[PDB]
Design a protein around this ligand. Structure first.
Ligand SMILES: CCCCCCCCCCCCCCCCCC(=O)OC[C@H](COP(=O)([O-])OCC(O)COP(=O)([O-])OC[C@@H](COC(=O)CCCCCCCCCCCCCCCCC)OC(=O)CCCCCCCCCCCCCCCCC)OC(=O)CCCCCCCCCCCCCCCCC
Ligand SMILES: CCCCCCCCCCCCCCCCCC(=O)OC[C@H](COP(=O)([O-])OCC(O)COP(=O)([O-])OC[C@@H](COC(=O)CCCCCCCCCCCCCCCCC)OC(=O)CCCCCCCCCCCCCCCCC)OC(=O)CCCCCCCCCCCCCCCCC
Ligand SMILES: CCCCCCCCCCCCCCCCCC(=O)OC[C@H](COP(=O)([O-])OCC[N+](C)(C)C)OC(=O)CCCCCCCCCCCCCCCCC
Ligand SMILES: CCCCCCCCCCCCCCCCCC(=O)OC[C@H](COP(=O)([O-])OCC[N+](C)(C)C)OC(=O)CCCCCCCCCCCCCCCCC
Lengths: 58, 129, 460, 53, 482
């Protein structure tokens, strides 16, 4: 007979619930990307892609 | 079954007099009726004093402070016995110092030694010859 | 596998999966590739053995592959004194609570996951822990059945049992069940001793059902010589004998120590008349029947079948409307017995409820028609064989037959019922009527009923 | 957005009110004791000892 | 015998439990059963069991409440009662004496789309059960006087249906589920039409419906297959054959009609709430899966299970029982799966105190919806073991005969124990989730609440809460409050 410990049942239930809730992480990420998009653009092209060095002659 | 328990179990049921005004006719419910719900913090705040205590055959006597010394047992013995012995040897040493004299002494000595080493290295840094 | 994990991450059916094909196969046709074996029923063989100690083992051989049934019967409410009245009820209310080898939660989980069932039922002079489960789960289940049926009660078990017994008493009082009326009937019949102790136990002694009293009860009454273990559906007797031996072998033999013994029960012709202000009046009139040993017991059953099926309905319920309900009670005990009627009807005509009822019983003493006897015997056969067809009830009655008659008699119940004749039933009922009546009445106007002497004269 | 608000609120309320009611004649022995002895008022504490005494 | 000792645990590979596709050794064997079809269309099924002490013969006729009309409502009950009133060969006294002499166990049950007459007798007079039962259902004469005499009995039986509160709630669930079909009308008939049935109506009902193609006669217990087959060919072989020209009312599909009925009757001290989804039919692929679901969401009573035996409700392998243990006043719960030819109803019936009305209302909806997303293996194995024990526990001749007759009627086949075990054992967590989302997730409901509705009157309509209750963990807000 299958007599799992209640520790395991609790762990598996919480694992499933965590899986369910993680699906909204992308949702909130998209919401905060559409919102505050200028901030994301500034971050991307200031830290990950630093500007070029040289300056115009004028 | 049409019975309250459905014929399978007994239900510990109670109709609280709270949310009611009249127990009968136009007569009002007792002001402190709700206190009859025993074992509920909502009934009274006194239930928060929930220490375990049961006793039989016990009689206690307490006298009014109006028939007692204002400062009882103060300097009852000599100054030496009441202060030097009772307080500085049985209340301070026996309780406080006798418990932390060793660890605190060791910590103080170690800290002093290491601070002295630190200062010596600092002096070596600052001064030459 | 990875494919199953993927198809479960997204809740989409896997069409190619063989399990999907099996589960979605059309019900009209069998699943492709599977064709179970066919087998015929076999005659049941019963075998009985005894261990070095007094424990006995009974096995009913497999008749067709099915779930294995197991049980433990203890001859131990008649063995309850005023000190420990209601112990058996507390045991029943917490029959799953053991603390020696397995826990309450864990053995309940064993019951739940095995898919089978585990029940505990007690009467006067008998307790029975039965269980049914699959073969591969039998071993573990038996470990639960033995411990729960033989382990001394624990403090937590007694603490829970006190609360559950109080709740049971409250429910019984609230519902006014016929069990309480029968408790009063037995009290007046035997006198608060032996068979007179209430089946649910005295309410004043409920608070005294601590683990100490339960352990005293078990030590005094539970002994190896009064323990029967039973199996039904086991291919080999010796396998179950070994399974039992691995558990009940530890129990020491009780030989050489003064046994508790059961005092011979005495019959008392008392009467009880309770004013309850009930819109309905309940009367019960009983007499001393024969014990299990006497061969007339079957006849008495027929007499009951002559009342609860054919006569009592037509003569009382159909003709008269104030008769709420009438029935015939027939209890058998190792040393005594009880037989009679229990009726309930309108209070305002309580007297009319009594007289007529007696006449009906007296009519049985007058004689039985051939057609009525045949109908009653057919109904009794139908009921008995319906009970026997189910394996669990068959096993329970097998245990009780072995513990009472030392052999198995349920295999020839039909022949015994056939052998009954109208003359035997009439003579048995006439002899029973001569005994001192036991009369109980609860109702609004029970204060106005014929005196006990008048009751006897009418019965005469 | 006004039309979608209308659909969400007013048409929905009109749909929820499409109820069929039926009243029968119960003449069994049971007495309406629950009506006679029943009812709870959340503000009863404001009426107890103050009003209609 | 079996290889090695029978109590062996060798096959329990999956941590003390059998693998997914495996079945117990006991269920690997099936009792012999033979099914034959006659010229009339009558189907004779026999599943002998020599060791059994009784023999049961069950006649299932597909005639039922479905084949009635508003003007002929309740005629099925009249047929049920008039069958035993008399016939050309036998009088009322004659049939009563014959029934008494043999086994007096004659259970007659009339339900929507079917009527069953099950007679239990001794093995040595099984033929007498057949020849009698074939006669009574065939040559019974319906007199006008007799039909008039029994009107009071039928009317009273139509009023006492409220005694079995579960039965009445199921009748109301059928009513509310099919509001545009006669399949929703009560099985006891319309009260005021039960005094209008006459001899002509009964004769028409028993001539249109009681035809050979609608008869399935099953035999179980200690019955000789050849002798029973010959006796049934002699008896039921003369039944009139079905005529395609005749018109049978109510032959269209009873489309499911979601709704919420509130039978507000204070003074009842208790509340009966039934919540049902639409379920597959007898011939749907997901027929055994829904039975497995029923056994997942099993029965419950406060006198048993977690109601009285456990330290805490959480410490067990049943979520529904975990929820019900925490509700002291919710006394009874049972899950019903009712499959029919075209549709089905799968749901839960609760009986409990009205203070927990919002719990019983929203409990069964949640648990099933939860299985649409996640179901633990412990619950799967519990349901599997329960199903195996149920399959092995059908040992009484009457019940097994009735089940055989119903299976032959609705499938034209006797489903062996081994096949059912193989079908239901193959179920897995993923398959369970997919079936649940097909049948339970975000689906419509049929709800009935009979009893004190003071606390349920507000929100007694199909509002947002009702529609969002079929979502696991979404819309469970109203269950956990109170
Ligand atoms: C180098 C050489 C040196 C040589 C010299 C060496 C000298 C050595 C000296 C050694 C001294 C040892 C002292 C031992 C103390 C032991 C104490 C003790 O055991 O107590 C228990 C002892 C015994 O009681 P018991 O235990 O019940 O035993 C029973 C007895 O057998 C019997 O009990 P009893 O009831 O009979 O007790 C009698 C007891 C009394 O016992 C009682 O019953 C208690 C009575 C309490 C009364 C308190 C005063 C009430 C009035 C307050 C003022 C109100 C003003 C309102 C104005 C309104 C305006 C609109 O006697 C008194 O009446 C004494 C009370 C004195 C109170 C003083 C408080 C300050 C008053 C300030 C007045 C200011 C006026 C301003 C006007 C306006 C200006 C603009 O009780 C008392 O002593 C109670 C009174 C304690 C008073 C303490 C006052 C402390 C003051 C401050 C510290 C002193 C120095 C300050 C320096 C300031 C510099 C700026
Ligand atoms: C730099 C500026 C100044 C900084 C100051 C920093 C001060 C740090 C204090 C650290 C300890 C605090 C402990 C708090 C309570 C938690 C512990 C506790 O309860 O333990 C259970 C323990 C056992 O109690 P139990 O078993 O529950 O029994 C009930 C008791 O009988 C119940 O007890 P009881 O009610 O009967 O007694 C009440 C208690 C009342 O005491 C208090 O806690 C009251 C304190 C009031 C003032 C606190 C704040 C002062 C802040 C000043 C600076 C302010 C700066 C910021 C200003 C504003 C911003 C600029 O009175 C006593 O018992 C006094 C006994 C100690 C007297 C001295 C005897 C030893 C003399 C010989 C050794 C001299 C030093 C040796 C150094 C190392 C080399 C050997 O309790 C005690 O006995 C402890 C009593 C309290 C502490 C006594 C003083 C110990 C100091 C050791 C420091 C060593 C540090 C390392 C070396 C440093 C080298 C420089
Ligand atoms: C260092 C951080 C300090 C600042 C505080 C930061 C707070 C951040 C809050 C926003 C992000 C939350 C993300 C997780 C959300 C989980 C929701 C949930 O219920 O869980 C689902 C399920 C439970 O499902 P449920 O439906 O039962 O949810 C209800 C849960 N309760 C009852 C607790 C309210 O739980 C899980 O299995 C996942 C839990 C994830 C969170 C675990 C936290 C502890 C372990 C990781 C961190 C450890 C270090 C902490 C810092 C210590 C520093 C020394
Ligand atoms: C650089 C940008 C890259 C962007 C790439 C975007 C591509 C997206 C492609 C999506 C394809 C479709 C996927 C469907 C999955 C469905 C799963 C499912 O069944 O869900 C049900 C479950 C919950 O189910 P439920 O319980 O809600 O309901 C089930 C419904 N019934 C009952 C009917 C079956 O949800 C999940 O599985 C959610 C968890 C999985 C997804 C988690 C993704 C986390 C990503 C976090 C953001 C990372 C950003 C990068 C960070 C980088 C940092 C350096």
């Amino acid at each position: 007979m299958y007599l799992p410990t209640f520790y395991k049942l609790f762990h598996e239930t919480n694992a499933f619930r965590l899986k369910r809730y993680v699906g909204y992480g992308p949702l909130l990420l998209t919401w905060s990307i559409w919102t505050l998009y200028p901030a994301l653009y500034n971050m991307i092209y200031s830290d990950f892609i630093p500007p070029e060095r040289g300056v115009p002659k004028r | 079954m049409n019975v309250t328990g459905a014929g399978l179990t007994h239900v510990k049921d109670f109709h609280s007099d709270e949310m009611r005004v009249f127990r009968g006719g136009l007569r009002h419910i007792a002001d402190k009726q709700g206190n009859l719900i025993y074992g509920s913090v909502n009934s009274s705040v006194r239930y928060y004093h929930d220490k375990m205590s049961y006793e039989r055959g016990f009689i206690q006597h307490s006298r009014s402070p109006s028939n007692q010394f204002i400062n009882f047992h103060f300097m009852l013995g000599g100054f030496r016995t009441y202060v030097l012995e009772r307080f500085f040897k049985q209340v301070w040493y026996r309780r406080n110092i006798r418990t932390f004299w060793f660890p605190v002494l060791i910590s103080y000595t170690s800290g002093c030694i290491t601070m002295r080493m630190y200062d010596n290295n600092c002096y070596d840094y600052f001064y030459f010859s | 596998s990875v494919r199953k994990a993927f198809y479960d991450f997204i809740y989409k059916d896997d069409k190619s999966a063989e399990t999907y094909k099996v589960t979605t196969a059309d019900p009209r046709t069998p699943v492709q590739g599977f064709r179970g074996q066919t087998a015929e029923d076999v005659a049941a063989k019963y075998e009985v053995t005894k261990l070095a100690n007094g424990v006995t083992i009974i096995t009913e051989s497999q008749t067709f592959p099915s779930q294995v049934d197991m049980g433990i019967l203890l001859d131990v409410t008649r063995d309850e004194t005023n000190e420990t009245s209601g112990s058996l009820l507390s045991i029943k209310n917490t029959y799953l609570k053991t603390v020696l080898n397995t826990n309450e939660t864990i053995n309940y989980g064993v019951v739940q996951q095995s898919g089978g069932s585990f029940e505990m039922e007690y009467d006067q002079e008998t307790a029975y822990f039965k269980a049914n489960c699959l073969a591969h789960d039998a071993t573990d289940v038996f470990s639960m059945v033995a411990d729960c049926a033989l382990e001394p009660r624990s403090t937590v078990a007694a603490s829970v049992g006190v609360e559950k017994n109080q709740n049971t008493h409250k429910l019984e009082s609230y519902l006014k069940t016929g069990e309480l009326f029968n408790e009063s009937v037995f009290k007046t019949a035997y006198g608060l001793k032996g068979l007179g102790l209430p089946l649910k136990g005295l309410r004043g002694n409920v608070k005294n059902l601590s683990s100490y009293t339960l352990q005293k009860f078990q030590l005094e009454n539970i002994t190896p010589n009064r323990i029967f273990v039973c199996a039904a559906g086991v291919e080999s007797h010796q396998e179950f004998v070994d399974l039992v031996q691995t558990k009940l072998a530890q129990i020491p033999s009780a030989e050489g120590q003064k046994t508790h013994q059961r005092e011979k029960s005495e019959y008392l012709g008392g009467e009880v008349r309770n004013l309850t202000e009930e819109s309905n009046v309940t009367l019960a009139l009983l007499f001393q029947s024969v014990p299990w040993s006497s061969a007339d017991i079957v006849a008495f059953n027929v007499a009951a079948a002559l009342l609860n099926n054919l006569r009592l309905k037509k003569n009382l319920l159909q003709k008269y409307a104030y008769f709420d309900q009438a029935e015939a009670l027939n209890f058998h005990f190792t040393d005594s017995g009880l037989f009679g009627l229990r009726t309930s009807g309108s209070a305002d005509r309580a007297k009319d409820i009594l007289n007529h009822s007696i006449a009906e019983l007296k009519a049985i003493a007058s004689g039985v028609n051939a057609d009525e006897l045949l109908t009653a015997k057919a109904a009794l056969k139908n009921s008995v064989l319906s009970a026997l067809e189910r394996q669990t009830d068959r096993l329970e009655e097998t245990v009780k037959n072995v513990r009472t008659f030392n052999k198995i008699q349920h295999t020839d119940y039909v022949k015994q019922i056939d052998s009954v004749t109208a003359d035997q039933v009439a003579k048995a009922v006439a002899k029973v009527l001569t005994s001192n009546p036991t009369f109980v009445a609860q109702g609004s106007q029970v204060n106005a009923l014929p005196t006990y002497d008048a009751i006897r004269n009418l019965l005469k | 957005i006004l039309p979608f608000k209308y659909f969400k609120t007013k048409a929905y309320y009109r749909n929820l009110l499409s109820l069929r009611w039926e009243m029968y004649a119960v003449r069994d022995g049971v007495y309406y004791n629950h009506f006679k002895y029943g009812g709870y008022n959340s503000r009863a504490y404001q009426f107890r000892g103050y009003f209609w005494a | 015998k079996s290889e090695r000792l029978q109590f062996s645990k060798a096959r329990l590979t999956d941590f003390g439990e059998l693998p997914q596709g495996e079945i117990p050794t006991a269920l690997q064997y099936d009792r012999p059963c033979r099914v034959e079809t006659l010229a009339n269309g009558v189907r004779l099924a026999v599943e002998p069991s020599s060791v059994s002490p009784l023999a049961a013969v069950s006649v299932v006729v597909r005639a039922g409440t479905r084949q009635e009309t508003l003007e002929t409502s309740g005629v099925a009950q009249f047929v049920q009662r008039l069958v035993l009133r008399g016939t050309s060969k036998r009088n009322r006294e004659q049939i009563e004496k014959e029934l008494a002499l043999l086994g007096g166990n004659l259970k007659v049950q009339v339900g929507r789309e079917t009527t069953t007459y099950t007679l239990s007798v001794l093995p040595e007079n099984v033929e007498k059960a057949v020849d009698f039962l074939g006669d009574i259902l065939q040559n019974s004469v319906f007199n006008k006087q007799q039909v008039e005499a029994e009107k009071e009995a039928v009317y009273n039986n139509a009023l006492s249906a409220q005694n079995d509160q579960q039965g009445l709630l199921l009748e109301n669930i059928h009513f509310t589920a099919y509001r545009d079909h006669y399949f929703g009308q009560p099985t006891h008939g319309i009260r005021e039409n039960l005094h209008n049935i006459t001899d002509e109506v009964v004769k028409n009902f028993v001539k249109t419906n009681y035809v050979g193609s609608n008869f399935v006669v099953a035999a179980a217990g200690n019955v000789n297959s050849q002798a029973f087959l010959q006796a049934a060919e002699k008896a039921f072989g003369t039944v009139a054959q079905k005529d395609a020209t005749t018109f049978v009312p109510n032959t269209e599909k009873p489309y499911f009609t979601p709704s919420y009925m509130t039978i507000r009757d204070d003074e009842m001290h208790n509340l009966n709430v039934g919540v049902f989804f639409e379920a597959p039919s007898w011939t749907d692929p997901d027929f055994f899966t829904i039975n497995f679901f029923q056994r997942i969401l099993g029965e419950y009573q406060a006198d048993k299970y977690t109601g009285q035996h456990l330290n805490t409700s959480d410490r067990q392998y049943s979520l529904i029982h975990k929820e019900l243990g925490n509700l002291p006043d919710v006394t009874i719960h049972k899950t019903h799966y009712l499959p029919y030819s075209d549709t089905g109803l799968f749901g839960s019936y609760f009986y409990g105190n009205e203070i927990f009305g919002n719990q019983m209302l929203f409990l069964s909806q949640m648990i099933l919806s939860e299985y649409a997303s996640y179901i633990n293996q412990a619950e799967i194995y519990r349901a599997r073991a329960k199903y195996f024990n149920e399959l092995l526990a059908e040992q009484n001749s009457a019940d097994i005969a009735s089940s055989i007759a119903t299976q032959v009627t609705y499938l034209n086949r006797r489903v062996p124990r081994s096949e059912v075990a193989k079908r239901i054992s193959s179920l897995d967590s993923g398959l369970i989730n997919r079936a649940a989302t097909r049948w339970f997730w975000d689906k419509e409901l049929a709800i009935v609440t009979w009893g004190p509705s003071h606390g349920l009157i507000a929100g007694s309509h199909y509002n947002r809460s009702i529609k969002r209750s079929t979502l696991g963990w979404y819309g469970n807000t109203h269950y956990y409050i109170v």
